[PDB]
Amino acid sequence: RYRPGTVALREIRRYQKSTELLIRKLPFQRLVREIAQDFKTDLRFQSSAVLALQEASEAYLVALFEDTNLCAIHAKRVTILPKDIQLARRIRGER
């Protein structure tokens, strides 16, 4: 309820125990369809294939977040900021 910051810990632990995906199927599928149509038209996707991409995304993405996390800790603060994301992206060696 009240005391902001308490509910965040409960939510983060509950979700850390869980191991499901985090993106709704249809919006992500439509986005992949659009970005494919950008490259070539009338491409038939395998329902297994899309799923594939999906998982990889979160993997990559979550790793990035964690890095930004420790970067914020290096700056004597808790909240993460956009600037830290560019920090991680540049320092990783993938710009």
């Binding site: 850390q16 985090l22 992500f28 986005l31 494919a36 993405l61």
Partner: protein, 79 residues
């Protein structure tokens, strides 16, 4: 079209929870969407290259893993 807004606030919030953060700024979503879009286009370029080299207008799952392996990541449990 305009579907980048499809990845909405609660989903990225939950994945931030995956990351290990509780305090996040309200002006972080746009560059996250940009980074995600860059990753997807970079992967799907190799994906469509693979799928069109074999003269099949469909896209399978095993070539996706193949492109992921060529890029530097690796995916297990799919093919």
């Amino acid at each position: 079209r305009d579907n980048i807004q499809g990845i909405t606030k609660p989903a990225i919030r939950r994945l931030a929870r995956r990351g290990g953060v509780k305090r996040i700024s309200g002006l972080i979503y746009e560059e996250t969407r940009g980074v995600l879009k860059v990753f997807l286009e970079n992967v799907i370029r190799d994906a469509v290259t693979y799928t069109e080299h074999a003269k099949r207008k469909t896209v399978t799952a095993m070539d996706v893993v193949y492109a992921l392996k060529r890029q530097g990541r690796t995916l297990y449990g799919f093919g």
